[PDB]
């Protein structure tokens, strides 16, 4: 009944289209939730999409000025993958930060809400409020914004608390049926760790995070699900994935330390490893969240100083808006497949012809077959939609 | 299969956020039922929210003047906890008063409707109309407006009939698979008993009610689920929980009798006991239903003249509107947890910029871990919503 992710990793030559929600296009006619920060997670049967909704629909007076991220009204919305966030959507907890697991028996939700100084994480398992934690650093407590990973019933959640540009306390929480059985403080070479995309690299969990303080390469957190031992490093490829980042001609990585290049802010993203090569995805524009491309860097998990791509794909076009992206793993018949989702953000603070901010999602999965080209933007026309 | 609530009570140091429906905020855009008097109840798998809907949506011509409580059109609406009362909501009985149990096998609904003089209470079990009762006092027959409690298949419902300010006949009905097997008249020191919040204090049921006639402390009804013997008293803590109430410095309780202080009206609320201490919740404003705070009074279940709070929480801010609140118990892995819900009322008779009255719900559950601070109001802006 429990899920242990024991199978090997599927052979990946690229990613094929899997899903699209068309949320903003449907919001022009119809009642659709205003969301942001989505992700995808699958129980052993099918896949579900999650988002953080702002407590209102888009054709709503309350949709005005929804660019904030921490309000008492944001909740965690869950549907099946494909069903748009209509008014029948079940909102499963109060949260302005969230993460979700399925251990093979029941769903686990980690939900953060509250004052920026105090902040509480409620751990909800099987429809019960099983546990709760308070901020340790008395700052904005926050978590992965994507799926967490369970192996043998022990699920792991990475939670950060502290300054965005400075030393912050990051912890890894080991949860069993909603109860927190252990908590390990982060240790290693990664200085700033946020919004991690974790995947089961049996026998453990590997997370690729964002460095929001001093690096444009991504941190790596290796969690031993068993000994509860944490290792930290940086993604070693010379083609770094955070945005803002420097141009490919002049970008660098350290494989241990932040590169100290255009590391002021960042975006949530993903990466995983195929032998020595690294499969990664990033925005096409190096400074704005415009476009989205995935590719493979040869000897990129093992060598800084490698800038050799292969199997490049353009999931969203250079001039079309993207945002947070993340990884989730799907148990196949003989191996474990890796899929990713891209959040396509539309609205205020970058397009001033509307008063709202919302997102759509586009989902791709790895394939051992062949694939073509394309581009799957959001597609909404905001010049005609209601303000 | 039956539910017997045999486990101990969970260790409670406070309550953590569990759910929020954002009904009024979504009602501005979208079709949402106009409701009031909600509650929450859980079958052994998940939790459901119930409400008494006025037979109309909010963006409706029939939404005008919905402040009445007894109309031929109010029905009992049931969704999963989290799903807002959209137009796909199943309305499970005709009722302007209601209560609901789950005995581990099927749902029980007690639904009161009809004329104020001759009223009818239908008892519906497993989708059948199993039983029915008429008013005994030929007055407004009414019930708990929250969940009832079943132990070994025998469920218990507290029903009052008679004058709101005077001697009213209160009875406790013992139901088995929808059939009323016994009926005990209330006996003890509690004079007026209404809108009880009951919880399984194995081996029996303990209900904390409202005194709408002569007290601002809450009555207590101890039902022996087995011998069908009823005991009545009052909540003994010096910090009384009803509203209207006197200020903390000048409040009193009797442990046996109404205190005769600001006892004219009241509000439905809850309280339970942790050893000698009492965990309770009340509105922050002592006269209006504004705000909501929960805390613990030390030796408050055994000693009057005790005004020693601890573990205070502010669930709804002092400047925001609240209403009915109630308790419901959730069976955990090793103990029984206590949760409460608060009804956030918005609209006419207190905010004259709209013609309707509705409510939103916020749900908290007890926790043995730590928690922070916050405030979770309804958030609707009625200056911009349709009248």
């Amino acid at each position, epitope marked *: 009944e429990y899920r242990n992710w024991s199978k090997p990793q599927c052979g990946i030559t690229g990613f094929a289209p899997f899903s699209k929600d068309n949320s903003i296009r449907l919001s022009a006619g119809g009642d659709i939730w205003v969301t942001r920060e989505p992700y995808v997670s699958c129980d052993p049967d099918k896949c579900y999409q999650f988002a953080l909704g702002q407590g209102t629909t888009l054709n709503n007076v309350h949709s*005005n*000025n929804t*660019v*904030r*991220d*921490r*309000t008492p009204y944001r909740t965690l919305l869950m549907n099946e993958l494909g069903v748009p966030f209509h008014l029948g959507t079940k909102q499963v907890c109060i949260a302005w930060s969230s993460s979700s697991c399925h251990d093979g028996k029941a769903w686990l939700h980690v939900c953060i809400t509250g*004052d*920026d*100084k105090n902040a509480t994480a409620s751990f909800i398992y099987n429809g019960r409020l099983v546990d709760s934690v308070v901020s340790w650093s*008395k*700052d*904005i407590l*926050r978590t992965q914004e994507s799926e967490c990973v369970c192996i043998n019933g022990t699920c792991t959640v990475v939670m950060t608390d502290g300054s*965005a540009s400075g030393k912050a306390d990051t912890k890894i929480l080991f949860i069993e049926e909603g109860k927190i059985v252990h908590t390990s403080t982060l240790s290693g070479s990664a200085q700033h760790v946020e919004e991690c995309s974790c995947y089961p690299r049996y026998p453990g969990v590997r997370c690729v995070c964002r460095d929001n303080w001093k690096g444009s390469n991504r941190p790596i957190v290796d969690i031993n699900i068993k000994d509860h031992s944490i290792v930290s490093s940086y993604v070693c490829s010379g083609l770094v994935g955070d945005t803002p980042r420097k141009n490919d001609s002049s970008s660098s990585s350290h494989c241990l330390d932040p590169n100290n290049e255009e590391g*002021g*802010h960042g975006v949530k993203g993903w990466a995983f490893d195929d032998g020595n090569d690294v499969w990664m995805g990033r925005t096409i524009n190096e400074t704005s969240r415009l476009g989205y491309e995935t590719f493979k860097v040869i000897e990129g998990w093992s060598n800084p100083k490698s800038k050799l791509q292969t199997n490049r794909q353009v999931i969203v076009d250079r001039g079309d808006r993207s945002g947070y992206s993340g990884i989730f793993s799907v148990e196949g018949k003989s191996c474990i497949n890796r899929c990713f989702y891209v959040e396509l953000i539309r609205g*205020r*603070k*970058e397009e*001033t012809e509307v*008063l709202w901010t919302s997102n759509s999602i586009v989902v791709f999965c790895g394939t051992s077959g062949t694939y073509g080209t394309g581009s799957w933007p959001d597609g909404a026309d905001l010049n005609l939609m209601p303000i | 299969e039956y539910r017997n609530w045999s486990k101990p009570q969970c260790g409670i140091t406070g309550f953590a956020p569990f759910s929020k429906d954002n009904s009024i905020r979504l009602s501005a855009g979208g079709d949402i039922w106009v409701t009031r008097e909600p509650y929450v109840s859980c079958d052994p798998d998940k939790c459901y929210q119930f409400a008494l809907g006025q037979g109309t949506t909010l963006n409706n011509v029939h939404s005008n003047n919905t402040v009445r409580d007894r109309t031929p059109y109010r029905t009992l609406l049931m969704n999963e906890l989290g799903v807002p009362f959209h137009l796909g909501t199943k309305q499970v009985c005709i009722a302007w008063s209601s209560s609901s149990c789950h005995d581990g096998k099927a749902w029980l609904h007690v639904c009161i409707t009809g004329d104020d003089k001759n009223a009818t209470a239908s008892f519906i079990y497993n989708g059948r109309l199993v039983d029915s009762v008429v008013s005994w006092s030929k007055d407004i027959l009414r019930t708990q407006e929250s969940e009832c409690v079943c132990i070994n298949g025998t469920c218990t419902v507290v029903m009052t009939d008679g004058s709101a300010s005077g001697k009213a006949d209160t009875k406790i009905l013992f139901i088995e698979e929808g059939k009323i097997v016994h009926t005990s008249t209330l006996s003890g020191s509690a004079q007026h008993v209404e809108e009880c919040s009951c919880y399984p204090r194995y081996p029996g049921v303990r209900c904390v009610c409202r005194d709408n006639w002569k007290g601002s402390n809450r009555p207590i009804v101890d039902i022996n689920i087995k011998d069908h013997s009823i005991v009545s008293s009052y909540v003994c803590s010096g910090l009384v929980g009803d509203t209207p109430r006197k200020n903390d410095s000048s409040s009193s309780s009797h442990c046996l009798d109404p205190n005769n202080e600001e006892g004219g009206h009241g509000v439905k609320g809850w309280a339970f006991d942790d050893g000698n201490d009492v965990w309770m919740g009340r509105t922050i404003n002592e006269t209006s239903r504004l705000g909501y705070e929960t805390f613990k009074v030390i030796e408050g279940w055994s000693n009057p003249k005790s005004k020693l709070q601890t573990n205070r929480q502010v669930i709804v*801010d002092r400047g925001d509107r609240s209403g009915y609140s109630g308790i419901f118990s959730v069976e955990g892995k090793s103990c029984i947890n206590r949760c409460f819900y608060v009804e956030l009322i918005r609209g006419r008779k207190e905010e004259t910029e709209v013609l309707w009255t509705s409510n939103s719900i916020v749900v908290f559950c007890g926790t043995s871990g730590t928690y922070g*601070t*916050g*405030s979770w109001p309804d958030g609707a802006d009625l*200056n911009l919503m349709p009248i």
Partner: antibody
Amino acid sequence: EVQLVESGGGLVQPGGSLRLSCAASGFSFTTYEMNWVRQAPGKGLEWVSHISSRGLVIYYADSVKGRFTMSRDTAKNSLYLQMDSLTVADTAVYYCARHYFDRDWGYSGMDLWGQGTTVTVSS
Amino acid sequence: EVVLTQSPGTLSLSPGERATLSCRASQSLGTNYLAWYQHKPGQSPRLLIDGASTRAIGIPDRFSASGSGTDFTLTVSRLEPEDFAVYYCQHYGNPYTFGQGTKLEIK
């Protein structure tokens, strides 16, 4: 409607103390960064101090540093400026303003402003 | 340590022309923590531009802004009678600093 109302502006002889208060309606200080900004008569805007939503005073202007104390009450939603040893250069119109720190994008910018209170140090 | 010198002081023009205001910065700064405010006298400051390129909520379409590093520019493309005021450029990242302003007066 959100509003900020500053109060406490008055004549102060040099060497004195005045406490300015800014009462906020429609939002909570537990999620917003609050600022004191002053305009001396005939000069431009000057950023006096800044406090986080987590309650830390992030910055005090060099002139005001050591003489002014900025605090907040998150129960009454009030912001306070205790000005000590007021000099004649501190005569100005004072303004409480509000901005935001977003987890994703970062600091935003002062979008809500008060009416203003004038503090004149004289003679 | 970053001093924001608004370049034109007391620019004067007539309704319906294009006005270009400039904020030059001593040292280079993150081009997303600079903002532009309007302070009509007797009224509280109002935020026009944020992140050096983003129009605020409610601001007319006349105002636009641009810039990078040490250079910043604002332009009201077609002036209006009530768009005559003082304009400040602010750096709300570390180090915090305002500008001295630019006065627009009807000729």
